[PDB]
RNA sequence: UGGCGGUAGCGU
DNA sequence: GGAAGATCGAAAAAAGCACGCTACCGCCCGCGTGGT
DNA sequence: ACCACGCGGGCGGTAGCGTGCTTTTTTCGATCTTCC
């Protein structure tokens, strides 16, 4: 389908063409030439050569570089054929199926919070506001402060005091998942109770650093927000720092 | 995102997944060497039927 | 001890990249000043370690990925296999030093069959009991070394393993629950310490260092002219 | 010594015991000189464009009548300078104009004499020029070409460790590597034969190439193997015998000469037997008949009676063959001497295996292997073999390649031909055979003598040669096709291929890297970098352990400390301080020659190969007077090892202790007390420092800061000495001295300091004036300090009060606690400049234009914009504001009466023009500081561009007016003196204007003649200045070249003042790094007895673990320096007399233990002492050399000089409680750096944003506002926990379920936490992909 | 498509492959294909046809 | 506001 | 007692080479045409 | 002279381009070795 091979505009009057479209165009042109020459009563040698070219074009489309010389585009690199972007590290299996980008996520450096409890983690107020935006909108609609989603959008943008109170109330005991980039074992991702802090750095419990293999040398940590009752109970019971 | 097209090839072409992925499926089925299949597919030698 | 020794004492011998030991060691303290030659000599080990870590992280990650794949579909799906066959577990001793004792090796595991008291033909533990700390202490009090314990490799359950044949959860006092993804946990546990490892490529008689009796296994021998025994096995 | 003017302001105390003999050379000399060799005219054709032109030109077509020759080349004057190219975005380059002569011979004349000649100059593209700072300006961007470490051309011998066949037998190989041509390889096999491989293709027997070289079988046998002659004597066929040939073989027969049995049959030969045989001088001996049969026959023998070959070459003989030869009448035969211990029959075995028989068969086989599928013919095979190695056009061995080839073969001729010869191949094969036998040793690939450095010049020359040969073949075809009479050189050649190749090399090459601009040290390190990566080099993954290691030959050439950590470990290195490149390309180091036990001051540059032969003493060797060594035994490096040697065996000594380390590593004080890993990471990290608001000099330094600051182009350096006539924050005008006057010029020079210009890393570049009005200056002095530079000294950080102690866990594990006073004083506040670009192009419907009027926007949004449509300069802007208003036509247009009539009617033509105004990105705030407008020719210019042009013209007019004012003042003084020489007219002249002075005339004499001559000179000078101003105005108003389609570009610069905050990355110079944890109040930090609180608190727990003791020593030294500065400030506060200040400063400077530096304050004129004390009021800088720094005794003495404890630890009180601390803590002053890793820059948080259009997944990256990626190990960790609902929510609801996303959003808005699984879109994409691959895949419902 | 008559021993195949304008030899397998003389003879004379292919 | 390639860097 | 199954090492083809993140650059057919 | 597209495909050449891994799997000259 064309949507699986989109023609993204380049914002300069040109269209970026994917490798699949170019390979399909090559195959179509070769097939049309073969049909035209067959209708022309061409000699046996020419027909055989055209059939061989059609076979090679189909070969390049199905799996480029499998046999002979890999077909190269304007970049002087082999084209990403149909099977090229299925297998490998960049294939659909290992890039869009096993692991995928998710919403309601943030990332920042980690500092040491000595006052934090074992089940608590310091979260910046900006992250709490941005990540819990749908929850803030729902609470604002329930309280009657705003009548529509747009009014809640303006209220959140303007940073009203009622917005801050709503943010404090709605994330009072909503667990969040903290994860480090080299997640070796299951302890690399753990649930924590957010505590509103100022600044721009996530505060981490000193005790959990050993299990996290976490370094206050500038390491970066990511935070995700469970957003259903099942996930909230699951993080509270199975993945909280007090349960490990 | 769902509708798919089709192209009517002038002449049949084999699938390389069953031809070059060792062991060759056509060669195993027909009990012929892989190079014979490669030669006949790439228009090198006539094959009796 | 090594780091403080390097700080206040001599740095000791250093090794060239080929692995050979340099005749002249570094006799300068970190508190004192190291000349250019000593620093140039010492840089070799640091460079080797950094390169080893850099080129070993990827290998460890690949091994962890393969291990987590090979056991991704293994979960607990039963409570008891009923099999009376298990692995024969004894403490491991290498040379003149005991590597791992029985108590730590069989902690949090279930016996495949009832272990009897040595020499009395009296049962010491039940057939299907889980060996916790008290059971291990009782077993070691009676000087027991050989125990038949149920193992995952002998789990008779198909399309998964049974809770009993696995053992303790190793993270909670109770036994393993039903439905836990033991395969992923095991693979991650094996693959995590891969970084701690290293990728670096580098007697005519027996001695006794303790007091005790001597026992022989798989032996046929003969007495020599002087009377000393010589083994023919 | 006489201190320089900039040095007299603030002299840094030096603690170096060793006296320096050689000054630090220019750091960038590796680059600039190289580029000179690429552009300087060369009388002989071996370097630069001249060599390429001589290699390519001349040309002869298929018809000999036509010819084209090259005369000379000239580099044109660049249109714009560095600054104009940088601002305008054009590439800094110069035209390349070459003189070409087209000669048409007389076709009718058989001898082909000249008939017509046409000489003309032709332009063949723009060659990019490289700035005086060692950088390139490509497409308006600053790029740097790094050197490449590559295997040198020549013959290299290698031997694998026997793992190939897995029995311990090693397979030797010899590789011939030309600069340009076909790599050749000779390899051994387990069967002990020789195989030749060309370009890593199929192996062939090595004798094939010898046969193809017109060598017969017998010639090869004689050349590769010695022969033993067996002659038919009266009986037993006595042979000439050499005793040494009998070593190591069992006596198969009794040996006897002159009737004396030396040994009998069946007994092993002994060395005593060999010596006895040599003493006997035996030349003839008896031979059993069976002994000859074991040997093989070398020369084929034929008999005239039989007419057939009884024997041939190279096969095993036998008894029947021996009898046939004996009866044939032949009496003399020659056999091979085969001894398995030392002379293996590898050549004979290879020849037996070889199926070729003559030259034609070998050539046919070589052609078939070279080009499979082509018909083997005699002429084609001959041509291919001749061109493979014996053609200068195809095979080219460089001069360094020839030198290495001759050195490895032990030939005494360094110079030689650039092509291979038969003798060279024969010698290579013989050397390989000798290596296999045991004689000699294999070469080391990691040896620095086998690795060459290719600079920018060599790669540029290679790319130029490629373009030149392309244009050469193109011009060959054009000349052959075209009509000779009417062909002109300009249209004859095409500059497209050469220009394209040059542009691609300069812009898109792997080694053409974006130059960093964090600090001058980073730029210096980047310029002086050697990378094995690149074309014809090692790959990141396929590197191996061995190459990344530090070879012993790296001493003095490549520092072992400064190298990137991670994937690029051991592959990227930095040049040493004294390292330099030889003419061949090998690195060399300076050394001091030691003769007769004394160390002379003369220096010699020894390369890597020559270093091994001699023995060199270490730099840290004590020397008494006359240069004798105090110790009987000195440590030395003789052959890749360190050992003790006697005093009189030394031949060379290291120049300085900084030779081993690089410039970046040498900047770290107390390096000898730092661990190798910590020092490595500190040296790497120093390049990431960001300049602060105010540059603060390092209290503890290494003395190399001045060299780094001066060598870098960040600071302004006075080209000529003089006095500062005019000093200003914008420009500095200096009147040069009478001694240094260039003839025929005004005598003033103007420096325009760059101000608040964005760097490559979005960092502000600020140049601040240093000198004052009337202050004399001299050549080489610093006039204005660049970024992170103080008084001509590089300063990447600030001196802060540091106390080592845990503080309530806020310093847990390398965390840093920062007092509020740091934020209050803006010590580490930084400025960041960001670029925002708006493009107005020509669309199909209609061209877009910038206008103030924008649809459906409030007046508040348009308030920031001007009438033209661009935000005012200096206006504070935030996220969502409109910096520039742009509207694009849509739907319909070209209806102006309706537009005028309906400008505000309810239709408002909203669909006709849609808003496309550039807006500030969300989360970005700052102040607009610069606006640039670029407009293509033929398009009406807006008023803002007119104002920018008027400002530029005003600046140029001001400079030209200053110059003209100086010149006219001089000329009018001259004319006044001339008039006074005649009619004085003093009273009226004082009352008369100078142009009325020109108006006045004198009587007819020589005075009137010179008066009118001076008037003519005056008007000529005025006209010349008018022409110069007109040219400058024309250059300013010249239109800018834009991309096809865009007609205007607007660039806006936003300045952001970033202050320190928790989460920012801070660190020192010893590799200790951390993140700010809490901005503690000033009243909470611990304070001393005097009540002064500390600024930074560091955790001591990190000191013993990393073994970086140097930071503690630096802290103690900084404490001592700050105590000295405190004493100076105290004596300055009492208004004490200059005598006491002089005495105290002299006492402070004279402290030490036989330091090389001596300071005499008696020659400071009693006035510069006050300035020095004012500069030293903050503190006294101390220069601590790298490996020759101050000891503990000197530090303790310096501390005792001030009123400070000798132990370096004081008593502190807790700020909050006020109670005494149980133990004294270590306080002092430490140099802290702010890294380029800001916490606010790492901020990223997304709840619901844009999604990819192919996989329906959230985007990635902070700029694109995308969520974080849940990796595979994250899924595995969730599975280990037993997480199922959370995993499903992560995989479907949050990422791919398009319906699920909307349902969940509407549920959360409604307050219900209900989840719908749906089905991921990526699974459907995969299903469609597999279906399109001809493979059925469907979901089975039942 | 272009038919070429020449002797390989006079002009080598590599030279023809390097001729300007010619892309590559029509080769089946390693060796270039040889056109039989009958095909050339039949294509030289009566191969052209007045039938219009583009409709 | 889409990706590909190259380069450099951060964290292990 | 010269051929057919075994094999044996030697050569050749194929697949994989940790994860997150940040910034910059360049590039997003390509040249040979046809009407004006 | 620029502006726009339209059929093709490695490139420019009257040839040749590559050139520092390891492990697994497949095939084949060539023996070999056992014997039909
Ligand atoms: Zn079981």
Author numbering:
A (entry chain J): 246 to 489
B (entry chain J): 99 to 147
C (entry chain J): 734 to 935, 947 to 977
D (entry chain I): 1 to 1342
E (entry chain P): 54 to 108
What does the paper say about this structure?
RfaH, a paralog of the universally conserved NusG, binds to RNA polymerases (RNAP) and ribosomes to activate expression of virulence genes. In free, autoinhibited RfaH, an α-helical KOW domain sequesters the RNAP-binding site. Upon recruitment to RNAP paused at an ops site, KOW is released and refolds into a β-barrel, which binds the ribosome. RfaH recruitment requires a 12-nucleotide (nt) operon polarity suppressor (ops) sequence, which induces RNAP pausing.
To ascertain that our conclusions would hold in the presence of NusA, we assembled a NusA-modified opsPECRec and determined its structure at 3.2 Å resolution. The cryoEM reconstruction revealed that, except for added NusA, this complex is essentially identical to opsPECRec, suggesting that NusA binding does not induce changes in opsPECRec or alter the KOWβ presentation. Thus, NusA could cooperate with the RfaH KOW domain to provide additional docking sites for the pioneering ribosome.
